[PDB]
């Protein structure tokens, strides 16, 4: 059966929460966990109340994001495909309560700091039923940090570093995103010089310009093993694709295109639609500390704008990767 809240998030880890994110699917905390950060997405279901203008998931609707995270945990740790571009999953449960009031307490300081598009979480009984799901923390989303990088070289490896994390597990699980927008992507600090990725048993090497780059958030994901694969159906879902005011919601139309409304089947393509609005972000969204005045600079825009009106010609992120100029 599910555990009470107070075994996930006993007091000293409800009081050290802070609200980072959220989407219709529910609230992402940051915490502490054995002097660790951790994030901690958290999602109702199997009740009868609307929650941010939708039904809640069942369990088995939740048990594709549970599986994917777990699979895509594992690459960090593998060997003939490998890559730290991903996230760890620590944790998952199921929890049966009312929502915390600290937790509350943190979804009203974002509330009033930034905004939030939810429901106040306030109104679950205390029968209520959530999934948790405990990440390690892979820093700050690429949409918060947009005004925050060095220069378009940073661009550049941000968009090496995704490439080759969709490529290595395009090979090794036959994976994609499937929701890959800027909110989906996250920066954290690095020391480290270069950032190491293996593909089929090939090690290479990628300039991390002070950044590590995990993808995040497998809500849309797809992936098989031996044939059996794991996806969200959004076959008979009619809002995903009706959305406006953002290359973003084009995105969700055009992979309905390229699949014909089949969710089940492979299509790395998707992967690339991704990559190709992540680099219209770039060149478009971002805020440089360095602005386009150098000869470098002017030539690594010339690169990514390149990348841009070529890429869509490529059938998948391996294929970007090993083939496209813009990373030789
Ligand atoms: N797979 C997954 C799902 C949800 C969150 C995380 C996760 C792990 N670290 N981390 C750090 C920041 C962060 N921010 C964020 C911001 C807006 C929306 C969302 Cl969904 C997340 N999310 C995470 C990972
Ligand atoms: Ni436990």
């Given at each position: 059966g599910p555990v009470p809240f107070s075994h996930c998030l006993p007091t000293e880890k409800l009081q050290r929460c802070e609200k980072i994110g959220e989407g219709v699917f529910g609230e992402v905390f940051q915490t502490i966990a054995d002097h660790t950060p951790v994030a901690i997405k958290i999602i109702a279901i199997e009740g009868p109340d609307l929650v941010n203008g939708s039904h809640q998931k069942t369990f088995e609707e939740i048990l594709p994001e549970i599986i994917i995270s777990k699979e895509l945990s594992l690459l960090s740790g593998?060997?003939?495909?490998?890559?730290?571009?991903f996230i760890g999953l620590n944790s998952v449960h199921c929890v049966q309560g009312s929502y915390p009031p600290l937790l509350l307490k943190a979804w009203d300081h974002y509330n009033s700091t930034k905004?939030?598009?939810?429901?106040?979480?306030?109104?679950?009984?205390?029968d209520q039923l959530f999934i948790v799901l405990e990440f390690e923390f892979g820093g700050i989303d690429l949409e918060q940090m947009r005004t925050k990088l060095s220069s378009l070289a940073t661009a550049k490896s941000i968009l090496h570093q995704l490439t080759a994390s969709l490529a290595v597990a395009e090979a090794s699980?036959?994976?994609?995103?499937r929701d890959l927008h800027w909110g989906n992507v996250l920066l954290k600090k690095t020391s480290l010089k270069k950032l190491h990725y293996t593909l089929n048993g090939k090690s290479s090497t990628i300039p991390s310009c002070g950044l590590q780059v995990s993808i995040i958030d497998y809500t849309l994901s797809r992936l098989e093993r031996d044939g059996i694969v794991v996806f969200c159906?959004?076959?008979?879902?009619?809002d995903l694709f009706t959305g406006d005011g953002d290359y973003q919601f084009d995105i969700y139309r055009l992979m309905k295109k390229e699949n014909n409304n089949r969710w089940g089947e492979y299509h790395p393509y998707s992967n690339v639609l991704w990559l190709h609005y992540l680099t219209d972000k770039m060149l478009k969204q971002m805020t440089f500390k360095t602005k386009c005045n150098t000869p470098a600079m002017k030539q690594i825009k010339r690169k990514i704008q390149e990348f841009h009106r070529t890429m869509?010609?490529?059938?998948?992120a391996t294929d970007l990767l090993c083939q496209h100029s813009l990373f030789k």
């Open positions: 593998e060997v003939c495909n490998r890559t730290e571009g905004g939030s598009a939810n429901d106040r979480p306030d109104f679950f009984k205390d699980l036959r994976f994609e995103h159906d959004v076959s008979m879902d009619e869509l010609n490529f059938s998948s």
